[PDB]
């Protein structure tokens, strides 16, 4: 897992391209993804 | 001349009170801000 650098990521088949960073987003235990106003995935729980 | 000067100075004093106490005065400019923000938010929401 690579952080603070632009990468072509794929989490559980969710392909994208971006800078991954650690975050203060307080996901509730049942939630794996977070979405923007535009439906673009805005944060992810790492599955490992 | 002193009456006209005092009436001008007093009326210029009332402008600051009039603007400060009347949120609907600047509303013609705030509507330019609100319409263009609302138009961009509508354009982003349409990606969902």
From Swiss-Prot, chain B:
Shown residues in whole-protein numbering: 920 to 967 of 1273
Consequence of changing residue 35 to H: In strain: Omicron/BA.1, Omicron/BA.2, Omicron/BA.2.12.1, Omicron/BA.2.75, Omicron/BA.4, Omicron/BA.5, Omicron/BQ.1.1, Omicron/XBB.1.5, Omicron/EG.5.1
Region Heptad repeat 1, residue ranges: 1-48
General function of this protein: Subunit of the fusion protein that is processed upon entry into the host cell. Mediates fusion of the virion and cellular membranes by functioning as a class I viral fusion protein. Contains a viral fusion peptide that is unmasked after S2 cleavage. This cleavage can occur at the cell membrane by host TMPRSS2 or during endocytosis by host CSTL. In either case, this triggers an extensive and irreversible conformational change that leads to fusion of the viral envelope with the cellular cytoplasmic membrane, releasing viral genomic RNA into the host cell cytoplasm.
UniProt-recorded name of the protein: Spike protein S2'
């Amino acid at each position: 897992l690579v952080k603070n650098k632009c990468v072509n990521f794929n989490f559980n088949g969710l392909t994208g391209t971006g800078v991954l960073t650690e975050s203060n987003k307080k996901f509730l235990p049942f939630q794996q993804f977070g979405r923007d106003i535009a439906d673009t995935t805005d944060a992810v729980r790492d599955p490992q | 001349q002193k009456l006209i000067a005092n009436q001008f100075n007093s009326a210029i004093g009332k402008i600051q009170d009039s603007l400060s106490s009347t949120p609907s005065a600047l509303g013609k400019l705030q509507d330019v801000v609100n319409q263009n923000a609302q138009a961009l938010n509508t354009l982003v929401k349409q990606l969902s």
